[PDB]
Design a protein around this ligand. Structure first.
Ligand code: HEM
Ligand code: HEM
Lengths: 723, 722
């Protein structure tokens, strides 16, 4: 009554209750994680504690619940400037999404070099190991719009902004070492092919449709990066557990004018780990924010994303020594031939305060580079230089987007540029160079004092539109990639191809792709052709295959699961429990998990607390229904007679074990919890099943099984299970 | 050579020398024509035999390479072809709509059954011979452009009527009420339901803290929360949901008589919904399910069909109800005021280009025509200023009416000039009154059709204040609750319990169920239990609202009470492998075809399977790529070899378990029961149809399907692991 009426009257009272945790802005949750960039952004942060609600002109608002009307039942008056300003700001909140990589996630951190790279570059942020260079990273997918799901099969973008004392350096990479195309002129064609089709805008976040594969079949240059995205690299488990690549060959110029060709790498301290397809798909349905959320909670937990910056270094005289052109972006440089030197460390240790201000409005370009780094003649990179700044003029509202806080450098940046939309700087001095009325300040900087110069590379040829003959080589590296994959990874590649072409309606497109696969590997083609009902002619089964690359038929560095570099720390475990559960078994599991930095979450039939058979309340993390097995790495079911009975009448709790089994995950069953597995149509316990009566001992064995990531041996029987 | 060819200019042919792919509407249904579509032909491009050119008309010889300083050199700034191709691509994107960003569009027409001159002078409602063109966009609310179709959300429903007396936009939703009463709260409500601003989580979901925090503090939202928590929030198709303009409008007739009006759309294909677990899985394996369903249904001839209905109230009965008809959180119960079906709308042509037509279409509630008018509903009043304001940024300026999909098909002369991308070239005087052009174009007198506002009396004081008569938050939620079948009530409890499960701060969940105790004590207790909340004795005694003009239920607010289930156009999976019974499929298909139902053969691989009779039969797609959640029901024909392979296949055994848990009809012919009996599934209930003869098993199968879902199965479905 009075309580009812009060909700639609001005709210002058406290609303919060009188006084495990939700996600919060980084300033709230990790204020002790600072850097120079974050300190610069503080000038723009708002502390509204104890402030009046106001208009943008600073007028206190007395009634935020009602429009100005002519009678409390009347027509709204045009003179309600508060209503119109509030609605008008609302009406204009949206800006264009990125034309590609629209779906992204940001975090702040810092970078340090291990020791001076002055033997190879003058670049300031690689000279001094004591400097902490602030960074901001945006991870992304490629195909989908804002609001598409995270765990699609797709390439992942990886864009790092280095706020150095001598300029902002943008390393704009992907999570695979090659790209689909060789020349930038094909990029709108390729992108249009993979994007939703123009008549119906179908499908979202997916390459599994006609026009993408039509384009692949007609442009063999794409086959290499298709193999990468068709592998499990196409569905990583976390942005903390994938590799990063600059793809293009850059140049690094040292203080002696010498040039070294270089390729950029990010190696993850937490290993390289991926989902499997069926699990990646179900995750898009039940948590489209899975990667965004995982990254966010990673930082709040102190499991900071941590990556080592690696360089491949090739002397100028060595440019032409490989079977491939090192300026070809569909070619990787196998790490067997040119090792990766780890030269520094990046840590992401603080989430943003405002997604839109920081992550949405950030602007990265390959062209922003700093003295000591320079471009190569890669024709894809050369085209990128012009696109990033062009697109951002309309995405971010004009030529002054570097004045938006997240984009500003931390060093001076005086010049003679003036005006443009939303000009924030205010300049009084002469706006032309050379001038004498200001004694020509600001002034050009000699190269020996840090002024950018281009390396004087020789240029000889004719003005020409032509693909380099040194680029015509489309199958060598797809075949190298294939042969470096373990048996399971090859099977999943076959699954990627077979699932995707399965969604292509036009039959000639599937046959044209399968025909391209016969030039990569005959068994790969045969396996895919079988899943599609295609019969391969005797000719196709004899098609010529490429030979080794500079002596190499394999390179283990291209396999995710051969290197045995799986990391246990920071993984997520479901503890299925209900009322009547053994409280001390849970307590001992949580000690063993925390010992190895693993995160156990109690999932129950309802939120709140459950009561252990010892009568203590145990906090719940979520419900079994809202937290499917696809959201965790392994499942442990502790004991408690009444807990198990309850879990056996819950189809979700039982499906939890069938699903986790089919996704090759480790399952621990303490004591009478084995009844659940038994009830299910599940075969004999394999290596990935850990049964035991004492909790701390079950959990130790359970963690050791987790060290293998997935139980690949199980894959054949797992297919048979109805789940 | 084959390889070299692909990186050189492509002067040769590339074409080779359900069953068919989705295509532009101009290619598949060219015979479905209307006046707006003929106007759009003026802007269609036919590229057969044409050269690839720049935008200035210059022929391009090599679309494969940048201009370089040599074949391995540096790209040249003078390559204008490269820069023009890249620049256009760089600026393809325009802002998404601030709400309803995620949407699907189709063309069609509308006919009035008989003249409505008794009520309105609106030209498109006068003459039943006219086919007045329309364009409809369906949408969700919360999610951005690439979010899933089958989220739990309100669905937007926007119809543009291209009439000869102006373009009229009917911009409504699929539930008869909105969340809030005054437009000034729209940014607050929308911010609360949208992803939260620090992390931009979560997408296409209200299941998070800020949304329920807002609900808990704004009881006026509760009524439409009930609607979204019910199965209304997850419809099966845009063809099977209802539509409402929600606001009370006005219709004025030739005599100057005013009637209050509320708009309705009633689906000829009935009102059907998904269930929550099936909706959520559908967003994983097909985020485009509704967009695809609408497109294919039009290419198949199952044209969406809706009847435009009107609740009509004489201006004198404005105050005859226990609620304010100006309150957009209130519906008018169809018992109290029946809905008159006044005409039909059919959607029968897909667009040619999604971006040109669906993305660029602009609809505003302020786009009315002579014969319709506004009421003093304070939410509608704010909407009049917002639609046009936002379209200036989203669509590039004030000339967005000149974009083809947005143009009227009547004349539209005035004195407006310039603006960004001005298309028309106007030679005459640009002010009124003028003499140098004898004042053309001229004002139209009302008796010749010039718009006038009905002279409604206006009295009071300039004030910011919620009308006393708007302060009724709990009565219509209760009406809606008591009007639901038992299974629909359970599903509402499900929505509340799942959603509040994702809320982190406990006090928000507690404050929300506390609000539920003022709607129905047993709804509050069910939801409180699912969340571990113990209700106090005081809470359990909380006063409940009485009836509304003597009404305690209204059957029309229920989906599954008045048997609104249509069978025509449903989708049936047919699980077949190599070794299936040929004659069975034929007789299944002939039976399904007899009823307007589409059956789709799903096999382990794509292409063809061979029957035990040795013939080949076309597959529609894999079992793996088309889970049970995409079809209305499953049928498994016989064929010992088919059954044997299916039983080795995890997906096909799960197909039936999942079909079962989602309460769908499962047909099993012959030894197909071999497969059912192998799974942990109970004895065949009323929605499990066995039989050895296909036509009979199909006929009985199609008749279980008429009930939409086996609601009885619900209790045993919960315990099935799957
Ligand atoms: C080596 C292959 C390429 C890689 C690894 C790459 C990487 C990326 C990444 C990671 C982003 C997202 C940056 C962010 O988070 O804001 C991006 C955006 C973009 N890229 Fe690429 N890209 C490549 C090729 C191309 C090409 C060939 C073009 C066209 C010439 C292009 C044009 C763009 C544009 C316009 C954007 C959006 C920029 C913005 O709106 O801020 N990229 N690229
Ligand atoms: C009765 C409750 C409301 C309903 C049924 C409603 C319905 C809709 C629908 C269906 C759309 C999508 C139209 C399309 O497909 O393009 C939409 C968009 C929009 N609405 Fe509402 N709305 C309501 C209340 C509001 C309010 C209170 C405001 C703010 C004053 C508002 C502002 C907008 C804006 C700015 C758009 C985007 C328009 C565009 O970008 O073209 N609406 N509304």
């Amino acid at each position: 009554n009075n309580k009812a009426i009060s909700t639609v009257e001005p709210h002058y009272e406290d609303t919060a209750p009188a006084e495990v945790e939700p996600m919060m802005p980084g300033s709230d949750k990790t204020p002790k994680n600072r850097n120079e960039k974050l300190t610069q952004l503080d000038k723009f942060r708002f502390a509204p504690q104890g402030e009046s609600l106001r208009t943008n002109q600073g007028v206190k608002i007395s009634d935020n619940q009602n429009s100005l009307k002519s009678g409390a039942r009347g027509s709204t008056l045009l003179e309600d400037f508060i209503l119109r300003e509030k609605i008008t700001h609302f009406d204009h909140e949206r800006i264009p999404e990125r034309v590609v990589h629209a779906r992204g996630t940001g975090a702040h951190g810092y970078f340090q070099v291990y020791e001076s790279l002055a033997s190879y570059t003058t670049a300031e942020f690689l000279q001094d190991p004591s400097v902490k260079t602030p960074v901001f990273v945006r991870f992304s997918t490629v195909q989908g719009s804002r609001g598409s799901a995270d765990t699609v099969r797709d390439i992942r973008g990886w864009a790092t902004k280095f706020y150095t004392k001598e300029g902002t350096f943008d390393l704009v990479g992907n999570n695979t070492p090659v790209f689909f195309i060789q020349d930038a002129i094909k990029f709108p064609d390729f992108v249009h092919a993979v994007k939703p089709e123009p008549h119906n805008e179908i499908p979202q976040g997916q390459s599994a449709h006609d026009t993408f594969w039509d384009y692949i079949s007609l442009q063999p240059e794409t086959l290499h990066n298709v193999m990468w995205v068709m592998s499990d690299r196409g569905i990583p488990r976390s942005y903390r557990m994938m590799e990063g690549f600059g793809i293009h060959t850059y140049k690094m110029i040292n203080a002696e004018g010498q040039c070294h060709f270089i390729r950029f790498h990010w190696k993850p301290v937490y290993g390289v780990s991926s989902l499997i397809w069926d699990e990646a798909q179900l995750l898009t349905g039940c948590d489209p924010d899975f990667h965004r959320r995982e990254l966010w909670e990673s930082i709040e937990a102190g499991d900071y994303p941590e990556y080592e910056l690696g360089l491949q270094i090739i002397p100028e005289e060595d440019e032409h020594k490989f079977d491939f052109d090192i300026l070809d972006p569909t070619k990787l440089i196998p790490e067997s031939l040119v090792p990766v030197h780890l030269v520094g460390k990046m840590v992401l240790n603080r989430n943003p305060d405002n997604y839109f201000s920081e992550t949405e409005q950030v602007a990265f370009c390959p062209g922003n580079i700093v003295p000591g780094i320079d471009f190569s003649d890669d024709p894809l990179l050369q085209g990128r230089l012009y696109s990033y700044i062009d697109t951002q003029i309309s995405r971010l509202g004009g030529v002054n987007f570097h004045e938006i806080p997240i984009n500003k450098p931390i060093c001076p940046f005086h010049n003679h540029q003036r005006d443009g939309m939303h000009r924030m700087s205010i300049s009084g001095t002469a706006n032309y160079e050379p001038n004498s009325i200001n004694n020509n300040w600001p002034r050009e900087a000699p190269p020996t004092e840090g002024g950018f110069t281009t390396y004087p590379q020789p240029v000889n040829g004719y003005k020409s539109r032509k693909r380099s003959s040194t680029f015509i080589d489309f199958y060598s590296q797809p075949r190298l990639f294939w042969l470096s994959q373990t048996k399971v990874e090859q099977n999943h590649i076959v699954g990627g191809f077979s699932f995707e072409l399965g969604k292509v309606v036009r039959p000639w497109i599937r046959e044209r792709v399968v025909n391209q696969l016969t030039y990569i590997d005959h068994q790969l083609a045969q396996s895919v052709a079988d899943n599609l009902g295609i019969k391969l002619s005797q000719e196709q089964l004899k098609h010529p295959l490429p030979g080794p690359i500079n002596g190499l038929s394999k390179d283990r560095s291209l396999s995710m699961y051969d290197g045995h570099h799986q990391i246990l720390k920071s993984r997520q475990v479901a503890i299925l429990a209900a009322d009547g559960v053994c409280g001390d078994a849970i307590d001992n599991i949580m000690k063993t998990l925390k010992k190895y930095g693993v995160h156990g979450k109690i999932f129950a039939p309802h939120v709140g607390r459950i009561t252990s058979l010892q009568g203590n309340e145990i906090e719940v993390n979520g419900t079994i229904e809202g937290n499917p097995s696809v959201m965790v790495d392994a499942v442990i079911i502790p004991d408690g007679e009444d807990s198990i009975d309850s879990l056996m009448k819950n189809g979700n709790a039982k499906h939890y074990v069938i699903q986790a089994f089919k996704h090759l995950k480790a399952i621990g069953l303490q004591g009478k919890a084995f009844k659940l597995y038994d009830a299910l149509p599940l075969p004999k316990p394999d290596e990935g099943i850990v049964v035991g009566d004492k909790a701390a001992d079950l959990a130790e064995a359970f963690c050791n099984v987790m060290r293998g990531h997935r139980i690949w041996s199980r894959e054949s029987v797992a297919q048979e299970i109805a789940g």
